[PDB]
Design a protein around this ligand. Structure first.
Ligand SMILES: O=C[C@@H](O)COP(=O)(O)O
Ligand SMILES: O=C[C@@H](O)COP(=O)(O)O
Lengths: 191, 191
């Protein structure tokens, strides 16, 4: 059957600097992953694959290694942390202790000033999920928050579980949707 | 009336890099806080203030700027992240994915591989709290997880609330234990 492969962009510069969001490029080992992903996809022996990315440099650069064309979806853009974009957690805690604490009580519906919530991201992904449900083999090179929302849908996860879903870097999740439910397979690309 | 001044060390190098634990020294503006603290303390005109720090460079260095003598307590050292020491949250999610997920399940009792938990921390702080109770004016320059436990005791917090207490950097928490409970005053030192 067809499979949807979800994975985050290769490790970014900001990832490396403990900062969130932004629009940075891939780190040295971040590019190593892109290539390792290319080989993984190759080893799968797929005849036709649709590769989707976001408008972020980090997803695009990852796709560049695949050597194949890819489509850029804005809805696959990472969650907007608002004023807290490009900050570390400590930096957020110090200058926005009120907001940070408010997020922990309802991480699904909380929005940082000028930012999106997890709930917002979900609604924004509806068209992507819809298209995904009517396609064959698709690879979605996205982001942690985005990946969590898609992953929550295919695995019937509650909004409460969603924001805490396991979504590490350099790890490909092979989803195989069936009659009901979806098979999952985690493949870590050590680089 | 006696007051307990709880605060963290000045921003450390690892704090600046978003990595946990370790034993790094204060950053540039970390020192500015130490100085800003020295000013705030003098301005408080405290009578025979006792100063406690941990055995970590970051707490000691902050106390140095005070001029007045301080006392080091091993029992005030930050929570041991175990094998996850000095890693960033991403590194933790990628290399110890299951462990990271198991954390949020029960953050009070969860320990990283070969690491401490909030409960272990509470335990080694018992003596610290006893001494803190049989004193008058004390200034404790410690760490985040440590500060949460002391703060948890004085504000009569539950073990579930504890791990999520607001303990930002560069912020003095003046606790004035009274009859009805404990009065709180937060003084952020912007540097
Ligand atoms: O950019 C980080 C987003 O994934 C928000 O989720 P988080 O709780 O892991 O920080
Ligand atoms: O070193 C960080 C400790 O405070 C652990 O608690 P945390 O959930 O705020 O990271």
């Amino acid at each position: 059957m067809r499979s949807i492969y979800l994975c985050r962009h290769g490790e970014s510069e900001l990832n490396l600097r403990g900062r969130i969001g932004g629009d940075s490029g891939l780190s040295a080992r971040g590019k190593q992953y892109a290539y390792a992903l290319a080989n993984f996809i190759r080893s799968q022996g797929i005849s036709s694959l649709k590769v989707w990315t976001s408008h972020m440099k980090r997803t695009i650069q990852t796709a560049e290694a695949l050597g194949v064309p890819y489509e850029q979806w804005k809805a696959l853009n990472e969650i907007d942390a608002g004023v807290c974009e490009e900050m570390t957690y400590e930096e957020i805690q110090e200058h926005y202790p009120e907001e940070f604490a408010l997020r922990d009580q309802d991480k699904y519906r909380y929005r940082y000033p000028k930012g999106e919530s997890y709930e917002d991201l979900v609604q924004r992904l509806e068209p992507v999920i819809m298209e995904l449900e009517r396609q064959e083999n698709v690879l979605v090179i996205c982001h942690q928050a985005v990946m969590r929302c898609l992953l929550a849908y295919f695995l019937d996860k509650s909004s409460d579980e969603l924001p805490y879903l396991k979504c590490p870097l350099h790890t490909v999740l092979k989803l195989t949707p069936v009659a009901y439910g979806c098979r999952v397979e985690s493949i870590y690309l050590n680089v």
